[PDB]
Design a protein around this ligand. Structure first.
Ligand SMILES: [Mg+2]
Ligand SMILES: [Mg+2]
Ligand SMILES: [Mg+2]
Ligand SMILES: [Mg+2]
Ligand SMILES: [Mg+2]
Ligand SMILES: [Mg+2]
Ligand SMILES: [Mg+2]
Ligand SMILES: [Mg+2]
Ligand SMILES: [Mg+2]
Ligand SMILES: [Mg+2]
Ligand SMILES: [Mg+2]
Ligand SMILES: [Mg+2]
Ligand SMILES: [Mg+2]
Ligand SMILES: [Mg+2]
Ligand SMILES: [Mg+2]
Ligand SMILES: [Mg+2]
Ligand SMILES: [Mg+2]
Ligand SMILES: [Mg+2]
Ligand SMILES: [Mg+2]
Ligand SMILES: [Mg+2]
Ligand SMILES: [Mg+2]
Ligand SMILES: [Mg+2]
Ligand SMILES: [Mg+2]
Ligand SMILES: [Mg+2]
Ligand SMILES: [Mg+2]
Ligand SMILES: [Mg+2]
Ligand SMILES: [Mg+2]
Ligand SMILES: [Mg+2]
Ligand SMILES: [Mg+2]
Ligand SMILES: [Mg+2]
Ligand SMILES: [Mg+2]
Ligand SMILES: [Mg+2]
Ligand SMILES: [Mg+2]
Ligand SMILES: [Mg+2]
Ligand SMILES: [Mg+2]
Ligand SMILES: [Mg+2]
Ligand SMILES: [Mg+2]
Ligand SMILES: [Mg+2]
Ligand SMILES: [Mg+2]
Lengths: 185, 148, 127, 156
RNA sequence: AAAUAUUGGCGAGAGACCGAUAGCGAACAAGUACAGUGAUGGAAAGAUGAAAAGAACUUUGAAAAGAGAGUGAAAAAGUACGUGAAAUUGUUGAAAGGGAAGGGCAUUUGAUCAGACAGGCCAGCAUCAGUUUUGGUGGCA
RNA sequence: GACGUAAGUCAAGGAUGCUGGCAUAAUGGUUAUAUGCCGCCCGUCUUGAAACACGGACCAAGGAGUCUAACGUCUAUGCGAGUGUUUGGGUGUAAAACCCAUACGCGUAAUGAAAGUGAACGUAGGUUGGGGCCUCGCAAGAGGUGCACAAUCGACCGAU
RNA sequence: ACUAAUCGAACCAUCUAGUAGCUGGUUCCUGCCGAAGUUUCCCUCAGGAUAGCAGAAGCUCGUAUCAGUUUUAUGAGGUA
RNA sequence: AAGCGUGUUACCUAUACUCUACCGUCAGGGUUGAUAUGAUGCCCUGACGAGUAGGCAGGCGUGGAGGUCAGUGACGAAGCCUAGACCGUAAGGUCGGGUCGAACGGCCUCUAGUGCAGAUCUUGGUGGUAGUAGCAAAUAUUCAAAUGAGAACUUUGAAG
């Protein structure tokens, strides 16, 4: 017998592979598993882990988010890296000329980047030209703006969104939401 | 499909995952929303506050079409011009040739002011506009023409 | 012969017969886990039958090996047999139960020509 | 196909052995075993015979000739673990035994040469056996455990 | 009028449907046989063989039938008919058995069985390594 | 690592060497039996079952978390400020597959009972962290940038 | 009491697979993790909701934040 | 004392402790310019293994469906029997022999009316009980012949 301080046989709880069966994604993982092992550049390990992520955990990255990132001083010539999808954003009217490396590009995003004079690159071409992630800018989309996140942690005085089908008057706007009817949460 | 369900794995195990003691029964707490004010009060006040009780005025014979008014913001205002012809107006920004944007034919009732359009004059035809949206359009050199 | 292998250890040669399969004819001997609340077999009381558990697993260097040192490959014709042309030290052919007598003759002669061991070289013979 | 196929087969190559650090070194006999000692045999066709220890061969066998003219035991080999060494000793510095070795006793009607190899050795051994009293009869008698003999207390 | 409906009727085409305890209650002389005064209730029951070629003839028997013979690819297909499981049963063989029997570990005995000679089986000694157990003796504080 | 001046050797990152018998039921497996020791009848409710608690004489076949409407979290996939061809139309090798317009749904705006109003002072803010990247350093470290995310103070929209 | 072996409301069919907080049953194997009978509310006390205990999915990072432990310093307590 | 109090040693044996091996699980690593083509692969290192209710994971089996093996089969498919054999911890899989007579598998996938010892479970079949309980109310039968394979029981006669 052993007085176990920790739970036995506990899995790490981190993805060690993509749940996806996409063969090309698994080839990209084959590439960055090699690069993470045979280089000491932290970029390769970060990209590898991002390659494992689920869909909600790799939100879209907008071209305007990329352009804002390129406004960081000393960052205007960095290769933006997005382990995910880059979407188009018509709310920006001046896009800079830059090389963006991403898993997926939408048609609008690719057209906007190319029309700016820039380049759209796959992650393997990024691995060829920046094996240690040289001069790279990893960008991530907003995880907590998901609709599902609105409803997490619901409870009195927490101010989250109730899980509700129909909205408007008559749908949870009464006793429990105003002092005139009972109380307010 | 059936072969991936836990029913298949529970075969050979007596209680079918329902417990020996609790012993899955028909409707142990009632059917539907029973007891929402009595024995389901805590759940209902925790997750659906405001559920019970009444609220303001009633509207007999409400037709939603009376209220049709899709909003469009200025930051999306220039998307109503097709991409092929958009860049020509964005350059050479001047009056006497300014893009007429009919936001009603685009399916919009009111123009709101989320703001930061380019400094190009545009003629915005709309049923309704917010006060700030008309400020930004005028500041850019355009105008809003009230239509019906 | 077969490739040299370590000694073959089984760790449990005795069949794992189902509890009370000797008691009632309706209970078959195929192993079933006792799930009863009071079961002496489930609770592992002294004197009761042993249950299959992973600790009984065979040495990986010896698992699936016959006492002759070969893994069994089920063969239905000459093409399936010629799958083991370059593998005679690790695999032995076993003719499928439903192969006819005259086809078994063909399989055996081919196997002898290629040096492939046949685990059942007597099925459906005129002897 | 009755059985589809293994996608990738194991290697048919046979691995070489790792180099082994087991150097053979000479056997250290027990102190009780000195050439000329009389030996009780504990096993074999000549069970219980008392013989004379002549030489320690290179295969770790002892070469005994409990004189063939005394108890019929020929020039033969024995394993030192199947032997009791006694305190009684007859000098073997009158007999040549260097002609006897492992290839003398190879497997493949008695042969002619072993008879005079015995009839020369027995001359030298019988000569000193005649000196001390009762030893020739002692070498003729066989050993056995009588009732109440305790070999853990017996001296030999 | 049409676009709509259609567990009835008639006429068609179909199925990742069921396959004789399933599928309609009913694959069959099935809403039949049968129960109930009555309203009603309501089964079970498919398969010899390619073809009866469904066993002429002899013999034992009062006869059923048996034994032969014969037909058939097959009677280990004889209408008590494809295959023909289990429970239960007869016979033969083996074995054990002082108020149950059955089971686990181990081995004896009996019976039974596989593979290999291009090393397979069982051992003995020596010199070592790992882990231990039990002695003898030396030097110091 | 040790030994040897070196050669090389060794008990130093896991057994070799020598020899014998048999090559078959001899070892082994299976099975019946015997012997030693052990072993209460399962299932179930239950704090507690071998129970003088219940079901179970036996055997075969049948026999119980399903489908559907709406939905939550998570995951895969397609496209992405969009998305959804399949109500319908076109077409067909004909319930398939292939093609498609106008709409409609959900999303892209909230808030108020409602009338209504409706989202940049600022590099879309400041502060504290913050992976990664950049510069200097043999390195440590130092400095610049700092996405996601976290805490916090503000700004904007609506209600009051 | 009797009303077709049926009577403190016959029998037949259908609604009807009537509802059941209650009894019984709930069908392969192995591997890993692993409980609760306690809090609050309830015409609640053989039942639920709720929190807790549990699993699973992970995610953000990479030796911190920590800790059913002591020491030092400093509080508090009214039982023996 | 083989009792009581006490002291000393030796000794016995747990699924516990030490070491070694094998299985599995978890963790941390290695491995690409032939990794001398298994990268969900191979390999290195360390630790760990109780379990109802319950959760999850990897597998085994069954009916049907798309694809493949130009798979098996009247020279015998399937089914069934088999103290004959082999593989797997196991679900199970495979082979031999007998019976048998017409269809059926392996693999990759799809799908479900998909796995039974229990439900006083349904239907059907079958036991022990057991050649057992019994076949005892209504007073009562008997002789002979005939018939017949066979007569307590049929017929006729006689009689009661
Ligand atoms: Mg369980
Ligand atoms: Mg239950
Ligand atoms: Mg086995
Ligand atoms: Mg078994
Ligand atoms: Mg218990
Ligand atoms: Mg029927
Ligand atoms: Mg036949
Ligand atoms: Mg038969
Ligand atoms: Mg037949
Ligand atoms: Mg039949
Ligand atoms: Mg039959
Ligand atoms: Mg039977
Ligand atoms: Mg008796
Ligand atoms: Mg016994
Ligand atoms: Mg040793
Ligand atoms: Mg035996
Ligand atoms: Mg006992
Ligand atoms: Mg009780
Ligand atoms: Mg019990
Ligand atoms: Mg009860
Ligand atoms: Mg009973
Ligand atoms: Mg019953
Ligand atoms: Mg069944
Ligand atoms: Mg009912
Ligand atoms: Mg545990
Ligand atoms: Mg109340
Ligand atoms: Mg109860
Ligand atoms: Mg006090
Ligand atoms: Mg007090
Ligand atoms: Mg004492
Ligand atoms: Mg466990
Ligand atoms: Mg099938
Ligand atoms: Mg057959
Ligand atoms: Mg049997
Ligand atoms: Mg036929
Ligand atoms: Mg079923
Ligand atoms: Mg049954
Ligand atoms: Mg059960
Ligand atoms: Mg009687």
């Amino acid at each position: 017998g052993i007085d176990h301080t920790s739970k036995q046989h506990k899995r790490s709880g981190h993805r060690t592979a993509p749940k996806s069966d996409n063969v090309y994604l698994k080839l990209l993982v084959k590439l960055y598993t090699f690069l993470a092992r045979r280089t000491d550049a932290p970029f390769n390990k970060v990209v590898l882990k991002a390659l494992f992520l689920s869909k909600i955990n790799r939100p879209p990255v907008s071209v305007s988010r990329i352009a804002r990132a390129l406004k960081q001083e000393g960052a205007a010539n960095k290769t933006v890296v997005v382990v995910g999808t880059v979407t188009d954003d018509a709310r920006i009217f001046e896009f800079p000329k830059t090389t963006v490396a991403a898993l997926r590009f939408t048609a609008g995003a690719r057209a906007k980047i190319v029309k700016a004079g820039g380049e759209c690159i796959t992650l393997d071409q990024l691995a060829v030209r920046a094996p240690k992630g040289q001069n790279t800018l990893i960008l991530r989309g907003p995880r907590n703006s998901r609709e599902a996140v609105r409803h997490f942690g619901m409870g009195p005085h927490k101010g989250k969104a109730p899980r509700i089908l129909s909205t408007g008057r008559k749908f949870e706007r009464a006793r429990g939401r105003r002092r005139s009817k009972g109380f307010k949460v | 499909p059936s072969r991936f369900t836990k029913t298949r794995k529970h075969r050979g195990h007596v209680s079918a995952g329902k417990g020996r003691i609790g012993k899955h029964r028909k409707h142990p707490g009632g059917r539907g929303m029973a007891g929402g004010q009595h024995h389901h009060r805590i759940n209902m006040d925790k997750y659906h506050p405001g559920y019970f009780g009444k609220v303001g005025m009633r509207y007999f014979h409400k037709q939603q079409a009376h209220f049709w008014k899709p909003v469009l913001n200025l930051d999306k205002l220039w998307t109503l011009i097709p991409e092929d012809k958009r860049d020509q107006y964005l350059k050479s920004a001047s009056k006497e040739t300014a893009p007429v944007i009919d936001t009603l034919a685009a399916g919009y009732g009111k123009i709101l002011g989320k703001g930061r359009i380019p400094n190009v004059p545009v003629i915005v035809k709309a049923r309704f506009v917010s006060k700030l949206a008309e400020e930004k359009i005028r500041a850019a050199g355009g105008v809003v023409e009230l239509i019906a | 012969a077969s490739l040299p292998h370590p000694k073959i250890v089984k760790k449990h040669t005795k069949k794992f017969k189902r509890h009370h399969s000797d008691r009632y004819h309706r209970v078959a001997e195929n192993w079933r886990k006792q799930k009863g609340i009071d079961s002496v077999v489930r609770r592992r009381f002294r004197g009761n039958i042993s249950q299959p558990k992973i600790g009984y697993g065979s040495n990986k260097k010896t698992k699936f090996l016959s006492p002759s040192g070969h893994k069994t490959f089920l063969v239905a014709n000459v093409k399936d047999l010629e799958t083991l042309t370059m593998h005679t030290k690790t695999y032995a052919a076993e003719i499928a139960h439903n192969i006819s007598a005259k086809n078994r003759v063909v399989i055996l002669a081919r196997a002898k020509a290629l040096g492939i061991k046949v685990t059942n070289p007597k099925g459906r013979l005129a002897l | 196909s009755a059985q589809k196929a293994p996608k990738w087969y194991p290697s048919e190559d046979v691995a070489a052995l790792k180099k082994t650090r087991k150097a053979a070194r000479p056997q250290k006999l027990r102190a009780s075993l000195v050439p000329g000692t009389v030996l009780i045999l504990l096993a074999g066709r000549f069970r219980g015979k008392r013989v004379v220890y002549l030489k320690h061969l290179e295969d770790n066998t002892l070469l005994i000739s409990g004189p063939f003219k005394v108890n019929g035991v020929p020039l033969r080999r024995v394993n030192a673990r199947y032997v009791i060494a006694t305190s009684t000793k007859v000098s073997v510095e009158g007999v040549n035994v260097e002609k006897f070795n492992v290839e003398y006793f190879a497997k493949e009607e008695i042969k002619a040469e072993r008879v005079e190899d015995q009839k020369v050795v027995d001359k030298a051994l019988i000569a000193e056996i005649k000196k001390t009293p009762l030893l020739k009869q002692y070498l003729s008698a066989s050993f056995s455990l009588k009732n109440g003999d305790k070999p853990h207390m017996l001296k030999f």
